[PDB]
Nucleic acid binder design. Structure first.
Lengths: 238, 398, 109, 101, 124, 212
RNA sequence: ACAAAGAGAACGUUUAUAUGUAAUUGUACUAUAUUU
């Protein structure tokens, strides 16, 4: 189980839910993609243990005094909790997923929405599709400092990667195993900054850039124009 | 400076985001494709197989965000096909479509040079046997036993397995009467309006006997004890029963009349009616003193139609068992379920544009957005009704 | 990166500077392997990027100077946003870093 | 053809690099005439180069051009069993009379 | 696979000639061995031993004008005799013909007969 | 089939034909070079596009050596077009044992690595030290604490480029190694040998016969 | 085949070493010794 051939990407593109409204107070869910679940992890915690143990269950860890020993039942079970009971799912669905988020599901959803271990994914989706997309604007006054530099990047290299796409059932095995840097295979994650220590393709570019300075300086002084004419003076002598 | 002890570092150690397609249509035509070639047939794909759930996908596709679903220009279609997607479903057709565009029941007899008559399959001309055999018995005087009225959801309701239309040529259908039919019988009956005419009633779903049970507040698993004030109202009703004509103290547990069990709820949760009836103890007053709570029963009932017909068939089955009065859904007649759905869609095409609130009552998705849009006070009680419908199954769940 | 190599290619690396040169120095028929393509087409694209992240900084230190002068006008810290807004830089993370500057510096005290 | 292509800032497109077509190592191909690649990524295509030079026949069918004394009059780099230039019989006449030998 | 294939069946000199049993060369042998094993066996036609490497013989004034190409200060000792395996060659008088040992000590000989004076050194 | 048979490798000259492959990067197997463009070009043309000064500059001879493969014999004039076989031999001979001893390689140090156990610097920044091979392979190189002391990183690191004979020959024998050690002791301690280290022997040899 | 050497022995390999009969083999001063 890796790819169902239409595996929807997280898609952070910003299309807001119908009743999301002012982002449901926006700023309340303009929180980092885990701070979003941070409220979930206390909400979903509350969705048990005086939500169903208040009426119809027994999960508080008994002790020598006939009492909940642990503060709450083992939160591991809370995370992987299968609400296989229809209404007892709804009774824990009218609280956290539909209480606050207004994330109306489809029959398909609630059919897949079996355990909150999976339903966390569902609530992560809509907020992420409600996550307003970045406004990629550049003040032109800032561009002319970019659009004037002598040094510009090449910006065509990703296409020079060794193409790997095939049946991707074995594109996940490489994770649990140590095999993705095997036999010349290598994953490529584009970055912005490199380690300046020991990167022989970084330092080698510095002593190329730091030479482009000593040259460029020698155009300002007006000598490259002198020795470019020193040759011609020695070229037209006869 | 860095410290390395050494002998260290040991170098080697699917939910779809439901987006409205209005933002996707670059033009006008490719929208009409998504409307018809992607959603209309999806209604016809249910209008043929089982319209009992045609109102469930509506809530689902509304989550994905299409605009004009509940608007009539689907119901003006759905209500049409959900009748004749039976007319040909009982001729014998299995797949409703001959291609993407046309209907399986419209590929005419001649390849394309025909006007009105349709090429039948051996399933048809063998499913038209039980029709024409039902005709002879309808003229014989004996019981016109329509074998395809014993059919239902999981087949023949009688615990009997159902034979298939291309019957083996060595097992001809045993006829206890003796009226034999064969290919020469169903030969001349081929054109639609020359076959719609002969045996209309036997195929027409009977919506008249179930014209409306939907504009009347009903309940699934509620009794006379069923209440949130399990001490205030249920004992007040004793004070309503000892005070009623022909009084009996509230010493029994037999549910009150259906239409009045919701009247408990207008006075159960609303702590205004829980004291506006908290002082008055007559039986005549608890049903009469609330005109307002009865002038807005439509806004109370409709929300019990939509919300209980959206989420899962396990509700829509239950809901078709609550209203139309079934024991189970699986052991049911085919035509009457076509009736039960008809009335569910006869009203859905008036509930939208008539009732201004009903329009956004159905286009909406969340429970809250309807309250903020539609009648809130009619919902504070309706939410309680919904809070109570499961509170009796909850003990049955324990 | 675990490629299989001979007893001798373990020594061709040291005298060549590492695993980058020993691949790019040889060429095709010289480096007969087919792993010497899965990995060479990786160093090349990884070096072509390293020289992009670099110019990305000389394009950035260039943008610092046209701000360092524009940042000198400290008449009001509320028009400091307009100092960065002219260059599109977001005031939040800047003063935040400048608020780290009050701790990231005074951690070495 | 989209590698090492400077992109212009405002337009967001590959501005024309007149120097690009000269660092180009034209790789042969069977569906396309020749595909120009930047020199730096040429070494992944050293085989399809040696497979394009090779006479498209198996050698054993053009073996007759390799065993006899036409070995000297035939190119054989990368098994390209192609003929070398040969003077005509009328040219070798004039090209040896104009030396009056 | 500890070893891919040990004891390959070619080690027995299996006569797989294309005219004999129909199989061509084994795949390990190259399909075009440019020169046969006889041409690599006769060094006599390959190494100059009592053999006239330089075909061309120049006149008297033709050798008073190849010497005009030797650079100033060149000694005929620095140019060493090529090894065995390098075929003894002479392309004639070309650019820096002097550095070609065989051409040098053959143009030198044609100067011994043609009276011209070999101004540079000996084979010290 | 082949649309557009590719051109030869190095036909840059205008008169002389290109050198054989491999020499310029290709497939060994011919000791000649044939540019069909050069032959089909007639003589009056081939002599037109050049001058006498230039003709004597591509007829140029390197006979004992190759003009393209540095340090390599002219594989136009060898016995066979294939690259040399003795100056290219592998590590182990046909019947010799894999007795390649412990080799130590130099690496410039980019970090003042301070060993916890000895409180001793492996080395300061910009300091080339002969360390064990796997340490430099698995410990010092992955953590960016050092780089291989090739004679081109001495230039990148603003260092003075000093020779180390770094695996020039791989000494297959402990004698072959303990001799290669005696070579760097000549490169890094040249003045130790140029003359006497310090002739203790010939300066007042019995001087402490006197004065206690 | 195993162990040994060799490589800071994650393993791939090349030398030096006596194991099983693994398993095939075969075993009637001029003298006067010797070829088993």
């Amino acid at each position: 189980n890796v790819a169902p051939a239409d595996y929807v990407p997280p898609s952070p593109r910003g299309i807001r839910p119908a009743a999301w409204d002012d982002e449901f107070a926006d700023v309340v869910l303009s929180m980092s993609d885990e701070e979003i679940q941070s409220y979930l992890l206390d909400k979903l915690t509350e969705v048990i243990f005086a939500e169903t143990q208040r009426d119809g269950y027994e999960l508080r860890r008994l002790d020598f005094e006939g009492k909940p020993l642990t503060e709450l039942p083992e939160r591991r079970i809370i995370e992987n909790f299968v609400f296989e009971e229809e209404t007892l799912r709804e009774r824990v669905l009218d609280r956290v997923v539909e209480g606050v988020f207004r994330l109306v599901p489809t029959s398909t959803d609630r059919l897949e929405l079996k355990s909150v271990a999976n339903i966390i994914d569902f609530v992560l989706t809509h907020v992420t599709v409600a996550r307003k997309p970045l406004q990629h604007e550049i003040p032109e006054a800032a561009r002319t400092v970019m659009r004037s530099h002598p040094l510009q990047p090449q910006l065509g290299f990703v296409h020079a990667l060794p193409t790997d796409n095939r049946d991707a059932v074995v594109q996940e095995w490489e994770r649990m195993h140590h095999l993705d840097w095997q036999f010349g295979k290598a994953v490529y994650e584009p970055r912005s900054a490199e380690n300046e220590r020991g990167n022989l393709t970084w330092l080698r570019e510095v002593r190329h850039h730091e030479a482009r300075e000593a040259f460029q300086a020698d155009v300002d002084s007006g000598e490259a124009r002198r020795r470019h004419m020193a040759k011609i003076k020695a070229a037209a002598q006869v | 400076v860095i410290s390395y002890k050494a002998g260290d570092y040991h170098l080697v150690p699917w939910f779809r985001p439901y987006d409205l397609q209005d933002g996707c249509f670059d033009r006008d035509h490719e929208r009409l494709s998504y409307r018809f070639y992607n959603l209309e047939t999806k209604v016809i794909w249910k209008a043929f197989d089982t319209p009992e759930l045609i109102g469930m996908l509506l809530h689902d596709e509304t989550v994905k965000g299409n605009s004009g679903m509940y608007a009539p220009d689907m119901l003006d279609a759905a209500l049409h096909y959900t009748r004749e997607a039976r007319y040909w479903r009982c001729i014998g057709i299995t797949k409703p479509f001959y291609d993407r565009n046309t209907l399986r029941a419209h590929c005419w007899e001649d390849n394309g040079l025909q006007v009105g008559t349709l090429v039948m399959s051996q399933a048809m001309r063998h499913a038209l046997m039980d029709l024409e055999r039902a005709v002879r018995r309808k003229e014989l005087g004996l019981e016109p036993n329509y074998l395809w009225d014993r059919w239902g959801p999981i087949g023949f309701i009688d615990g009997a397995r159902a034979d298939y239309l291309p019957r083996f040529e060595h097992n001809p259908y045993v006829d206890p009467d003796g009226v034999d039919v064969t290919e020469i019988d169903v030969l001349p009956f081929n054109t639609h309006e020359q076959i719609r005419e002969r045996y209309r009633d036997f195929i027409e779903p009977d919506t008249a006997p179930f014209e409306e049970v939907f504009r009347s507040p009903s309940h699934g698993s509620l009794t006379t004890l069923a209440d949130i004030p399990n001490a205030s109202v249920v004992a007040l009703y004793k004070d309503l029963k000892l005070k009623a004509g022909t009084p009996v103290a509230g010493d029994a547990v037999e549910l009150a009349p259906a239409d009045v069990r919701t009247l408990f709820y207008l006075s159960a949760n609303p702590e205004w009616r829980a004291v506006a009836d908290g002082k008055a103890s007559w039986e005549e007053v608890v049903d009469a003193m609330q005109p307002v709570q009865a002038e807005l029963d439509e806004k109370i009932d409709a929300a019990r139609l939509l919300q209980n017909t959206r989420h899962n068939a396990e509700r829509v089955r239950a809901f078709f068992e609550e209203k139309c009065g079934f024991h189970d859904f699986m052991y049911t007649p085919d035509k009457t379920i076509t009736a039960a759905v008809l009335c569910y869609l006869t009203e859905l095409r008036r509930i939208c544009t008539e009732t201004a609130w009903g329009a956004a009552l159905a286009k909406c998705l969340t429970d809250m957005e309807r309250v903020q849009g539609m009648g809130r006070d009619a919902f504070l009680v309706y939410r309680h009704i919904e809070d109570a419908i499961l509170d009796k199954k909850r003990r049955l769940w324990a | 990166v675990q490629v299989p190599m001979v007893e001798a290619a373990m020594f061709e690396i040291e005298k060549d500077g590492g695993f980058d040169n020993f691949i790019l120095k040889r060429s095709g028929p010289e480096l007969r392997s087919t792993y010497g393509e899965r990995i060479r087409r990786h160093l090349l694209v990884r070096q072509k990027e390293t020289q992009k992240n670099f110019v990305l900084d000389q394009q950035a230190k260039a943008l610092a100077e046209v701000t360092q002068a524009e940042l000198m006008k400290a008449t009001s810290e509320e028009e400091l946003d307009a100092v960065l807004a002219k260059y599109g830089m977001d005031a939040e993370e800047f003063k935040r870093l400048m608020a780290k500057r009050v701790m990231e510096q005074r951690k070495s005290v | 053809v989209h590698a090492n292509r400077y992109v212009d800032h405002d337009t967001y497109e590959e501005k024309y690099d007149p120097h690009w077509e000269h660092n180009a190592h034209l790789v042969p191909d069977q569906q396309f005439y020749n595909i120009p690649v930047p020199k730096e990524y040429k070494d992944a295509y050293w085989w399809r180069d040696l497979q394009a030079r090779r006479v498209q026949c198996p050698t054993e069918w053009v073996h007759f051009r390799m065993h006899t004394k036409d070995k000297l009059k035939y190119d054989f780099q990368d098994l390209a069993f192609r003929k070398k230039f040969e003077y005509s019989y009328e040219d070798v006449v004039a090209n040896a009379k104009d030396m009056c030998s | 696979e500890t070893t891919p294939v040990k004891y390959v069946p070619e080690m027995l000199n299996i006569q797989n000639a294309k005219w004999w049993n129909g199989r061509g060369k084994p795949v390990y042998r190259s399909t075009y061995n440019e020169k046969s094993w006889l041409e690599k066996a006769r060094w006599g036609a390959f190494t100059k031993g009592s053999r006239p490497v330089m075909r061309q013989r120049y006149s008297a004034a033709a050798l008073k004008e190849a010497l005009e190409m030797v650079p100033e200060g060149f000694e005929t000792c620095d140019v060493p005799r090529p090894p065995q395996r390098i075929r003894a060659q002479s392309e004639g008088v070309v650019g820096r013909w002097y550095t070609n040992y065989w051409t040098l000590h053959s143009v030198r000989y044609q100067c011994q007969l043609a009276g011209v004076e070999w101004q540079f050194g000996e084979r010290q | 089939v082949a649309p557009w048979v590719p051109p030869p490798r190095h036909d840059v000259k205008v008169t002389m034909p290109p050198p054989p492959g491999g020499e310029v990067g290709g497939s060994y197997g011919v000791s000649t070079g044939y540019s069909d463009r050069l032959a089909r070009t007639p003589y009056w043309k081939r002599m037109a596009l050049s001058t006498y000064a230039l003709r004597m500059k591509e007829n140029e001879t390197r006979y004992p050596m190759s003009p393209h493969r540095e340090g390599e014999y002219d594989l136009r004039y060898t016995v066979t077009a294939y690259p040399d076989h003795i100056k290219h031999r592998p590590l182990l001979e046909i019947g010799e044992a894999h007795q390649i001893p412990t080799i130590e390689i130099p690496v410039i140090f980019l970090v003042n690595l301070w060993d916890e156990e000895r409180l001793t610097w492996f080395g300061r920044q910009y300091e080339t030290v002969y360390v064990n091979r796997n340490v430099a392979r698995e410990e010092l190189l992955p953590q960016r604490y050092a780089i291989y002391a090739t004679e081109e990183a001495y230039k990148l690191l603003g260092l003075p480029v000093v020779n180390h004979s770094i695996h020039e020959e791989i000494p297959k024998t402990p004698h072959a190694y303990k001799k290669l050690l005696e070579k760097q002791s000549y490169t890094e301690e040249r003045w130790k040998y140029t003359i006497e280290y310090l002739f203790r022997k010939y300066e007042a040899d019995p001087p402490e016969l006197q004065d206690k």
